[PDB]
Amino acid sequence: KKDFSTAILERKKSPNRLVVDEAINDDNSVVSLHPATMEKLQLFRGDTILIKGKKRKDTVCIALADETCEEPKIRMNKVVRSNLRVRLGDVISVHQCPDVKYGKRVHILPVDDTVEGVTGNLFDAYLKPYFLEAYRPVRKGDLFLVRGGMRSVEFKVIETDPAEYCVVAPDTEIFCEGEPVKREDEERLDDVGYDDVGGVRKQMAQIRELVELPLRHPQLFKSIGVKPPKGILLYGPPGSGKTLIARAVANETGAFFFCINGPEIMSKLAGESESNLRKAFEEAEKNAPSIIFIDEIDSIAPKREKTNGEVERRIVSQLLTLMDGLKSRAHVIVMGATNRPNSIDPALRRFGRFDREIDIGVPDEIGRLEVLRIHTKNMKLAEDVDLERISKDTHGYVGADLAALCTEAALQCIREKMDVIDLEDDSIDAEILNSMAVTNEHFHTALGNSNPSALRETVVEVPNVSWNDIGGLENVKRELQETVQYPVEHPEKFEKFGMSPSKGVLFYGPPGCGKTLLAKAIANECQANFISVKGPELLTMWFGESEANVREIFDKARQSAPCVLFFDELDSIATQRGGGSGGDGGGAADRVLNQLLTEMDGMNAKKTVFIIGATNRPDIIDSALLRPGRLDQLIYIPLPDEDSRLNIFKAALRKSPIAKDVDIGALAKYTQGFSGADITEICQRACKYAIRENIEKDIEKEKRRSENPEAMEEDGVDEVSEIKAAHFEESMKYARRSVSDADIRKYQAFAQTLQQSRGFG
Amino acid sequence: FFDELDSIATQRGGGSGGDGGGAADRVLNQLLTEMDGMNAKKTVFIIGATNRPDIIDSALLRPGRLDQLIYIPLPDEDSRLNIFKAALRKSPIAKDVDIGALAKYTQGFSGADITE
Ligand SMILES: Nc1ncnc2c1ncn2[C@@H]1O[C@H](COP(=O)(O)OP(=O)(O)NP(=O)(O)O)[C@@H](O)[C@H]1O
Ligand SMILES: Nc1ncnc2c1ncn2[C@@H]1O[C@H](COP(=O)(O)OP(=O)(O)O)[C@@H](O)[C@H]1O
Ligand SMILES: [Mg+2]
């Protein structure tokens, strides 16, 4: 087997590919190769080559060679490096140029910023001295730097004969006509490539496999027979990168594009909407391959009960009729981009039309780090930044929020330098502009002054907690591993025996004993997705998103296989159908519980979704959840004993100082009958008392310094402040037992009545 | 400061009916949902007060949320003297007023009764 999920993004091994490296020659057209490398392409020193760039761009250079280079390296010139839209570590393709084709005239114009002091035409002074009889190749739209006197001027080719690229002949005599080139083009050279997107690598691979292959190799599909899909439907949290992904793939694939907008078409007068849609479709069709993107497709096609207007129904039905007309098959690939999948009229998700749904979710930690690394470039940031901590802090953040965070940090940086800047003057010294630098405290200030946008989403990612944190419970780990990891990791044994596994595990025990910790640990070990849903969450969404929200969760369960759906706090919902209970107060559970029961029975079709429960009141739970196929197996998590308390005490103080003055073995004797929450609380209270003692010691030292500044500095500065015996002795005098003897008696009786048939031995 | 949680943070009753399902449970669920997500930031602090700790919901004492309970006791003798002088800080007082006699007099009196 192979990791084919992201294998389409791999750098394929071809003789044309070479790794981009730094260069040593300042010539605008000379590129240095390796003597053995030229043998692969049958090249020699002095020849002319074509080097491809990004977004269907390319340039033409002169192939040179040196023995200090490497085989995969190319040593691209810095100006040509900017021309090719590549950097260090990139891969570029090199081809031969049999067509030298000296051009009769080449139009070249400089940039406005570097021509300060120029009195007129720059042809004789700058163009001809380095291009007369030099036979240098030039490609349209490329930048090359030249020098004259002390003035360094960058020039861009405006026109060529042929228009692609040609060699500057001695007869290429021109004069500076017009002035279209401006410095403001610096930020608008090329909108988006492929590397300018991060965090959605899997979805980007899906889109690539769906779109780029049909648009570049229809022969394979025609041979196999299956018609490629057309309608992609990107959906996700607002401002998560949908338009960016669509524009990236469209510009990189080289196909035609037609960026339709929702309100823009809805802004047209009646009759003009249909005409504009027809013009868009016809323009796309007449220049196949084409891509039609419809931003905010939900705006022009809402749900039926919310679009009773006549013209709205007219435009919706015209869109439907045109969409069913995709039989034209001119590689027209509609890419709708909504934000809520329920908001689109379900008539747009039948066979044909939009045959796909791609969920662009909130990026994970590595995705946030990647997008921050993308945005932090092209800024005068200092060399003491720390992106890892920033990425760790930011949670519930989408790409737009981080784009705003970088701007906020820069704004704080410019605000902090206003002490010298006076707004009474209309001019500012260049030193202030050149002295700007960004530090980590600026990012902390920006983060403290910013707010996330998507904390409410049901985030899905593999958890981090491992069995090391787990405080003992080896029997439960042994059972849970063979009940969860084996049926997914090793289904071959199950299918050979032909006895299908069950997909329900239920936890019941006293509060705070490692239920959620166990669920997250088993989710992390199996490397499966984890979806935590609470009782309060469902109870609130039953009034926020009505009943359908519940189904949405299971839908999100079945679109992210393999999945571990953890229904935390089932005691609020799974209460038994009390006869005396009535009204809304007693019947609120009577809807969510029934919807859950209906969904669980249909969930048995999949073989990669595992449902885990959690309760602290095993007696009040409804019997309907104990039917086979539903959450059948009941696993009891008891109050940890002496050795388990020792293990949890060991696991609690991993980050805290040594505190070796107290043997942790004696602690378990003290804390008999304490749950895990009480042990963690005791650790936290001891740490807080240690912090208070260190704070008062520091205050005493500062007071001593203030009383006598002449007094020499002592060793009373803030130390590590290891936790001492007095800390625990004082801390454990206020604690309490979270579970009384009556509750543990109840749990023990509940276990006893469930374990009365142990007579076999 | 979420003062007077007694009206909404009580345990759900089995004798509920009619309109009672729109109050004391919906606000409780929304408050819990917001509170469990509050823990993301670092400088937001939630403090609640209740006069009926014996009937408080058990879902508002889990880790996070409102975990650390603090008992506020009725003032003692010296505390009664302190509260008497604090309340009478501004009002003019005759030179013959014996605060200690009042402190001996007002055993078992809350702060509100001393102010009254
Ligand atoms: N996943 C991402 N990777 C890289 N850049 C991103 C990502 N998500 C957002 N951005 C940046 O976000 C900036 C501005 O937000 P943008 O991505 O245009 O919002 P949007 O997701 O298109 N909004 P909408 O789809 O209308 O809700 C862009 O210029 C991107 O560089
Ligand atoms: N066996 C254990 N190993 C490690 N930590 C534990 C264990 N049991 C309890 N804890 C502590 O309990 C807390 C989690 O309690 P939890 O299981 O979520 O209670 P509940 O399931 O009732 O919400 C964690 O902070 C963790 O430190
Ligand atoms: Mg958009």
Tokens found for residue A5: 């999920």
Cβ contact (<8 Å) for B21 and A537?
A: no
Which residues of B fall within a CB distance of 8 Å from A448? 43
Would you report the helix, strand and coil content of chain A in percent, each value rounded to 5? 40, 15, 45
Distance between CA atoms of residues A648 and A637, nearest Å:
14
CA distances from B81 to A320, B92, B101, B104 (A): 82, 17, 10, 9
Q: Specify burial of residue B107 (Cβ count, 10 A radius: 0-12, 13-18, 19+).
A: exposed
| CB distance A101 to A68 below 8 Å | no
Point out the annotated binding site of A for ATP: 509-517
Distance between CA atoms of residues B104 and B112, nearest Å:
17
| CB distance A455 to B44 below 8 Å | no
Beta strands in A274-403 (DSSP E): 290-295, 332-337, 358-359
Say yes or no: CB of residue A241 within 6 Å of ligand 1.
yes
| CB distance A337 to A242 below 8 Å | yes
* Preceding peptide of A110 cis, ω within 30°: no
Say yes or no: CB of residue A146 within 6 Å of ligand 1.
no
Mutation choice for ligand 2 from A464, A517, A674, CB with most ligand atoms inside 8 A: A517
Report yes or no: A455 at the B interface, CB cutoff 8 Å. yes
Distance between CA atoms of residues B58 and A510, nearest Å:
13
Tokens found for residue A460: 């899905």
Distance between CA atoms of residues A753 and B7, nearest Å:
39
Tokens found for residue A300: 């022009």
Q: What residues does A206 pair with on adjacent strands?
A: none
Phi, psi angle pair for B56, to nearest 5°: -70, 155
Contacts of A40 (CB under 8 A, 6+ apart): A15
Tokens found for residue A661: 């003055």
Experimental method: cryo-EM
Q: What residues does A359 pair with on adjacent strands?
A: A235
Cβ contact (<8 Å) for A677 and B63?
A: yes
Find tokens 């670092």 and name the residue: B42
- Among protein residues, the one whose CA lies closest to atom 7 of ligand 2: A514
Distance between CA atoms of residues A296 and A582, nearest Å:
44
Cα dihedral: A315, A318, A324, A326 (round 10): -90
Residue A245 C-alpha to ligand 1 middle, in angstroms? Answer: 8
In ligand 1, the atom with minimum distance to the C-alpha of A237 is: 27
Residue A483 C-alpha to ligand 2 middle, in angstroms? Answer: 21
Judged by its nearest atom, the ligand closest to the C-alpha of residue A239 is: 1
Q: Which of A92, A11, A13 is nearest to A49 (CA)?
A: A92
Point out the annotated binding site of A for ADP: 198, 236-244, 375
Tokens found for residue A504: 């329900």
Judged by DSSP in three states, A148 sits in: strand
Contacts of A85 (CB under 8 A, 6+ apart): A53, A54, A55, A57, A189, A190, A193
Distance between CA atoms of residues A557 and B64, nearest Å:
27
In ligand 2, the atom with minimum distance to the C-alpha of A472 is: 1
Report yes or no: B71 at the A interface, CB cutoff 8 Å. no
Distance between CA atoms of residues A553 and A535, nearest Å:
13
Residue type, A621: I
Say yes or no: CB of residue A199 within 6 Å of ligand 1.
yes
Contacts of A131 (CB under 8 A, 6+ apart): A168, A172
Q: Which DSSP helix (H) or strand (E) runs through A337?
A: strand A332-337
Q: Could you tell me which chain A residue has the CA closest to the CA of B63?
A: A677
| CB distance A616 to A511 below 8 Å | yes
Report yes or no: B19 at the A interface, CB cutoff 8 Å. yes
Tokens found for residue A420: 């010298």
Which residues in A413-435 are b (16+ Cβ under 10 Å) and which e?
A: beeeeeeeeeeeeeeeeeeeeee
Distance between CA atoms of residues A314 and A301, nearest Å:
10
Query: What is the crossing angle of helices A474-489 and A515-525, to 10°?
Result: 40
Cβ contact (<8 Å) for A585 and B16?
A: yes
Resolution (A): 3.9
Q: Where are the alpha helices (DSSP H) in chain B?
A: 26-38, 77-87, 99-105, 111-115
Which residues of B fall within a CB distance of 8 Å from A536? 29, 32-33, 36, 59
Cα torsion angle, A134, A139, A145, A147, sign? positive
Find tokens 């779109």 and name the residue: A211
